[PDB]
Amino acid sequence: KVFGRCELAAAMKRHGLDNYRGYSLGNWVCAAKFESNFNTQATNRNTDGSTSYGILQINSRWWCNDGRTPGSRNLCNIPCSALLSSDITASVNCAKKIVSDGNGMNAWVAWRNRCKGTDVQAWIRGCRL
Ligand SMILES: CC(=O)N[C@@H]1[C@@H](O)[C@H](O[C@@H]2O[C@H](CO)[C@@H](O[C@@H]3O[C@H](CO)[C@@H](O[C@@H]4O[C@H](CO)[C@@H](O)[C@H](O)[C@H]4NC(C)=O)[C@H](O)[C@H]3NC(C)=O)[C@H](O)[C@H]2NC(C)=O)[C@@H](CO)O[C@@H]1O
């Protein structure tokens, strides 16, 4: 599913991400935009051989099991395929774990390079939320 901007804002709010660990909703919508362009099905292979999955591009070296990243931790205890669903609950729940792991949202390198320090509030402009 390719979400629309306000539809994704509304689903992420509903799953408790607005202000989760201090990060307002515009941060999470900006991260999904540049990580996956709002597409739940996005996968990207990494040079260490891991693959990043879904809307928030959660990586298989640490967070999910895809059966082909040797010696990866599966900290969200989820097959990586679960993160490509049209329903974002698995992605939001694993993201909540990731953002609590000591480095906040700097774990999403498109957030750090394209959203961090910008007016993220523009990402939820106009949405009935
Ligand atoms: C090609 C490219 O850039 N791809 C990225 C892809 O790599 C992105 O996925 C991210 O990858 C990085 C690197 O593997 C992940 O960062 C590491 O995450 C672990 C777990 O949190 C960090 O370990 C933790 O570190 C803190 C202190 O630093 C400790 O207190 C914790 O206890 C410790 N946890 C454990 C279990 O040890 C580690 O330090 C990070 N390493 C670095 C170099 O930052 C990152 O989590 C991962 N992000 C996601 C969302 O999965 C992906 C997303 O940006 O997109 C691009 O594909």
In the block, tokens 């949202």 appear at 105
Resolution, given in Å to one decimal, reads 2.0
SS3 annotation, 14-63: HCCCCCECCECHHHHHHHHHHHHCCECCCEEECCCCCEEECCCCEECCCC
Question: 101's torsion region: left (phi>0), alpha (psi -120 to 50) or beta?
Answer: alpha
Pocket of ligand 1 (CB under 6 A): 44, 46, 52, 56-59, 61-63, 73, 98, 101-103, 107-109
Distance of CA 107 from the midpoint of ligand 1 (Å)? 5
**What are phi and psi for residue 17, nearest 5 degrees?**
-85, -20
Neighbour-count burial of 81, counting CB atoms closer than 10 A to its CB (0-12 exposed, 13-18 middle, 19+ buried): middle
CA-closest candidate to residue 95, choices 83, 87, 110, 109: 83
Residue with tokens 């509903």: 14
Neighbours of 40 (CB within 10 A): 21
Q: Helix (H, G, I), strand (E, B), or coil: what is residue 79?
A: strand
Q: How was this structure determined?
A: X-ray
- Which residue has 């679960």 as its token pair? 82
For residues 38 and 51, give the distance between their C-alpha atoms in angstroms, rounded to a whole number.
17
Three-state DSSP class for 95? helix
Q: How wide is the angle at C-alpha 126 spanned by C-alphas 15 and 17, nearest 5°? A: 20
Query: Which residue, by CA, sits nearest to atom 16 of ligand 1?
Result: 107
Residue type for 1, please? Answer: K
In degrees and rounded to multiples of 5, residue 106 shows phi and psi of -65, -15
All structural domains of the chain? 1-129 (1.10.530.10)
Q: What phi and psi, each to the nearest 5 degrees, are found at residue 2?
A: -100, 110
Which residue shows structure tokens 């009935």?
A: 128
What three-state secondary structure class fits 2?
A: strand
Distances (CA, A) of 24 to 20, 97, 104, 123: 7, 16, 12, 11
